[PDB]
Design a protein around this ligand. Structure first.
Ligand code: MYA
Length: 373
């Protein structure tokens, strides 16, 4: 049905079923040096997120114009510190924070970002980028600025010798490598009824009773992750992710950056057993939503000794302790084993996973081992 942009891109066609593994087109051995042309009156600006004024401009763009949840009651609320965590992992490059501004006023009307990541896709491990935070101001919508943003970040990533990318979207584009669903678990139902995040089925008081949790976790030895846990968390994660077909491959520095706890950004808890050994961990990140609503998002949960269902029940208890109103998790990895048992309900809409310039068979949600922010 005619994707005018995506039909020119090195991606599989929709409905074409891929039994091969590999690049769609050859690597470019000479790359366009000039930026692509924006519509009249707009210009590229690389955003330095170390400048507090510029970082404020970006989260103002994103808080007003970014992904809205399905029924448009709520939009994500991004703190500066959350953006620094997500946009400056190890290896971040300044040209990959790619802004669009009005020429005359220098107002920030658009953004797209790339961060480097090593991606394990089936039997191949390849250095790639993760594309995130594509955003166009509500007043600039449907002007074909998004294809220019995408071509321009592609060129900038090509200049660094990286020809593959991974990204997610809620829309269907050619062609998903995997499709996931959102599930939500009510922590503070009373507050969720007011914003109309939820509704009563049947009584206010038995809903609270249905969703009530213990005040402290069940698992012995659960404690926040510390610096001395970085190597074992790294080793548990790498071994755990081998069972999935699409996963990140993290160095120990990346493990520190993604999992080391930062208040109101990311929490990690390890299970240290009676021997002093760390056998398990759970993690979730913080993303509030504006009308605020404090939501937790399952990140990476690794179990060796503790059963997965016990780990996630403890995660729910910890999130509630910290004042989260809701706990969100995708149906990927092993999550379908605890989702219904722990009283998650299913959300609206799909998260589709994609590869750029890598053709490969699609996979079931349970084989997707990658969580983005
Ligand atoms: C080797 C390195 C490669 C690196 C690049 C890898 C590829 C990365 C690709 C980007 C990864 C994004 C990862 C994330 O961050 S996903 C989150 C995307 N952000 C939002 O949804 C925030 C709110 N919405 C917006 O800001 C705008 O609606 C956006 C910017 C999404 C589109 O702006 P607009 O509404 O004004 O439309 P247009 O006239 O300018 O252009 C319309 C074109 O956009 C296609 N479209 C719509 N939505 C998406 C989407 N989420 N991914 C890819 N394509 C998308 C559409 O099919 C059409 O093309 P085609 O149908 O004619 O063919």
């Amino acid at each position: 049905r005619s994707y005018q942009f995506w039909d020119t891109q090195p991606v599989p066609k929709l409905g074409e079923v891929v039994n091969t593994h590999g690049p769609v087109e050859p690597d470019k051995d000479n790359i366009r040096q000039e930026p692509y042309t924006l519509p009249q009156g707009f210009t590229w600006d690389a955003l330095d997120l170390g400048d507090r004024g510029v970082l404020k401009e970006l989260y103002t763009l994103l808080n007003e114009n970014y992904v809205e949840d399905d029924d448009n009651m709520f939009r994500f609320d991004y703190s500066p510190e959350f953006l620094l965590w997500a946009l400056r992992p190890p290896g971040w490059l300044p040209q990959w924070h790619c802004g669009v501004r009005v020429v005359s006023s220098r107002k920030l009307v658009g953004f797209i970002s790339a961060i480097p990541a090593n991606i394990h896709i089936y039997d191949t491990e390849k250095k790639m980028v993760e594309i995130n935070f594509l955003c166009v101001h509500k007043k600039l919508r449907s002007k074909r600025v998004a294809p220019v943003l995408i071509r321009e970040i592609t060129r900038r990533v090509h200049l660094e010798g990286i020809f593959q990318a991974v990204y997610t979207a809620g829309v269907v584009l050619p062609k998903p490598v995997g499709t996931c669903r959102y599930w939500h678990r009510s922590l503070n139902p009373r507050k969720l009824i007011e914003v109309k995040f939820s509704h009563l089925s049947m009584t206010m008081q038995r809903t609270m009773k249905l969703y009530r949790l213990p005040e402290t976790p069940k698992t012995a030895g659960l404690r926040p992750m510390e610096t001395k846990d970085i190597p074992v968390v790294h080793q548990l994660l790498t071994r755990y992710l081998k069972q999935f077909h699409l996963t990140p491959v993290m160095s120990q520095e990346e493990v520190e950056h993604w999992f080391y706890p930062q208040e109101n950004i990311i929490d990690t808890f390890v299970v240290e057993n009676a021997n002093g050994e760390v056998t398990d961990f759970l993690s979730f990140y913080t993303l509030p939503s504006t009308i605020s609503l404090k939501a937790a998002y399952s990140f990476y949960n690794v179990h060796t000794q503790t059963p997965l269902l016990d780990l996630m029940s403890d995660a729910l208890v910890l999130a509630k302790m910290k004042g989260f109103d809701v706990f969100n998790a995708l149906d990927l990895m092993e999550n379908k084993t605890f989702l219904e048992k722990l009283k998650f309900g299913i959300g609206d809409g799909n998260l589709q996973y994609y590869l750029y310039n890598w053709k490969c068979p699609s996979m079931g949600a349970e084989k997707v081992g990658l969580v983005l922010q």
